[PDB]
Amino acid sequence: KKVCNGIGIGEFKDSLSINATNIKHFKNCTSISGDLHILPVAFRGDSFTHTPPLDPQELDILKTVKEITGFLLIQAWPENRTDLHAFENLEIIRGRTKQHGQFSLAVVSLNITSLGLRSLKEISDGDVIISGNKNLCYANTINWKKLFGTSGQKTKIIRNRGENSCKATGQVCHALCSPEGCWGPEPRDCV
C-alpha cells in the first residue's frame, strides 16, 4: 500500500492536471489523498508550463490506484481507447472533496463506449455526472444507489448515447449478467 498526493495538493499544488511531467510520481500509488484531474492540456501539452504532451500509454500507471479520497474528473481521454482502462482497479471514491462542491465523479464528452470501472464498489459522497459521451452505452444499467453511501446522492446521466440506440446495435449486458447491471459488454465486465 502506498499513499500519494492528488492534483492541486502538495508537490502538485499548482498542477492543473495529471500530465507528462507529474504522472511518473504516481507510480505504484494505491491510494490518492486528494483529487484527480485529467484535462485536455494533459494530451496537448502546455508551453507556458514547459509540459510535454502525455503519452496515452503512461495512463497505465494509474492501474494500481484502488482508492481516491477526493473526486475524479475526466474531461479528456484518448479516442483510440474504448473505456477507462487505467481505473480498472479503482474500488472506492470517498468524495471528501468535490468538484464545484457537489460532484465526486465526472466524465465529460469522451469517445469511450463503456466506462470499464469493474472494481468500483462504493462512492461515499458526492453526485455522479456522465455528460456528452455520444458513444457510451451500459451507463443506466448499473444501480448507482447501491454504490452510494450518503443520503442526497444522485446521478446525472445526460446527453449520452440514447438507451434505444444502444439496444439496436447489441451493446447490452451479457447473458450471464444479473439485473445488477454491467460495466461493459464482456462477462468479466459484469457486476
Epitope: 484535462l39 485536455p40 474528473l73 474531461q75 479528456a76 464545484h100 465529460v108 464528452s109 469522451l110 469517445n111 455526472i129 455528460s131 456528452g132 455520444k134 446521466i157 445526460i158 446527453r159 449520452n160 448515447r161 440514447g162 438507451e163 434505444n164
Partner: T-cell receptor, first 113, second 108 residues
Framework: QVQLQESGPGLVKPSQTLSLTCTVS??????????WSWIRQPPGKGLEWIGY?????????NPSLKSRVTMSVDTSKNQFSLKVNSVTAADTAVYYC?????FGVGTFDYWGQ | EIVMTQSPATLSLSPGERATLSCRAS??????LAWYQQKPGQAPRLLIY???NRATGIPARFSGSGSGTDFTLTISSLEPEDFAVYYC?????????FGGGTKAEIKR
C-alpha cells in the same frame, strides 16, 4: 457579465456554405464547465438543435443535418463558429448560439440575440 | 430521436386565469426536461429545469411537474407579460429536441 452575440452574412445562395461566429464576453470559452451550442428557428416554426462543441475539441451534431455541419473554436478571440454547407431554403432560420452549464442547471441558460 | 409533443398548440386564456401546458415524450426522459419562454423577436428564456426547479429570476407563478414521459408547466395566474410561446426541451438524450411550441393568446 455573460453575453453571447452572433455575426455573419444574412444572405446565402443555395448549394453554397453558411458561416456564423459567436463572440463570447464575460467569460472564457475554454473551460470544462461549459458546452457551446447552436440552435436555429425557421421563421414561424420550432427550435432545432444543431450541435455543441467542447473545449477538448469534442463535438456533437444533429443527425438531421446529414453531416453538413462543422463547428470550431478560436480561443484567441473567444469565439466559436458554425459552418453549414449545401444549404437550401430549409436552412432559412434565425440562428442562435447558447451556452450550457454542465455542472449547473444542465441546459441552455444564456442565449444570443 | 426523442420526439417532444406539446398539446394543444394554442391556448386562449384571459389575464388572471390558471394556465396548464402539457408535454409528452416518445421515450422516457427521466427528469431531464426544461421549459422555455419566447416572446416575438427575442430568444428563449429558461423557466424550469429538472422538470420542477425554477431558474433564477423566474416568478413563483411558474412551476413544473412530471417525470418520465408526461410533464406539465403550470402558470398560477397569467400576467399581461406571460402571453408568448412556451417550449419544452429534453437534455437527457442526444440528439437534443424541443417541443413544437404552445402559444398563449389573449381570449376576447
Amino acid at each position: 457579465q455573460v453575453q453571447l452575440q452572433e455575426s455573419g452574412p444574412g444572405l446565402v445562395k443555395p448549394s453554397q456554405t453558411l458561416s456564423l461566429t459567436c463572440t463570447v464576453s464575460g467569460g472564457s470559452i475554454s473551460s470544462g464547465d461549459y458546452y457551446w451550442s447552436w440552435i436555429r428557428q425557421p421563421p414561424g416554426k420550432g427550435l432545432e438543435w444543431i450541435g455543441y462543441i467542447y473545449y477538448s475539441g469534442s463535438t456533437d451534431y444533429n443527425p438531421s443535418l446529414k453531416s453538413r455541419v462543422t463547428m470550431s473554436v478560436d480561443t484567441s478571440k473567444n469565439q466559436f463558429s458554425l459552418k453549414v454547407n449545401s444549404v437550401t431554403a430549409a436552412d432559412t432560420a434565425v440562428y442562435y448560439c447558447a451556452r450550457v452549464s454542465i455542472f449547473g442547471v444542465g441546459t441552455f441558460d444564456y442565449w444570443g440575440q | 430521436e426523442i420526439v417532444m409533443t406539446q398539446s394543444p398548440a394554442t391556448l386562449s386564456l384571459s389575464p388572471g386565469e390558471r394556465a396548464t401546458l402539457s408535454c409528452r415524450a416518445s421515450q422516457s426522459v427521466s427528469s431531464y426536461l426544461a421549459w422555455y419562454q419566447q416572446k416575438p423577436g427575442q430568444a428563449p428564456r429558461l423557466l424550469i429545469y429538472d422538470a420542477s426547479n425554477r431558474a433564477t429570476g423566474i416568478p413563483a407563478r411558474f412551476s413544473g411537474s412530471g417525470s418520465g414521459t408526461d410533464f406539465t408547466l403550470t402558470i398560477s395566474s397569467l400576467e399581461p407579460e406571460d402571453f408568448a410561446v412556451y417550449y419544452c426541451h429534453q437534455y437527457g438524450s442526444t440528439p437534443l429536441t424541443f417541443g413544437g411550441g404552445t402559444k398563449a393568446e389573449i381570449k376576447r
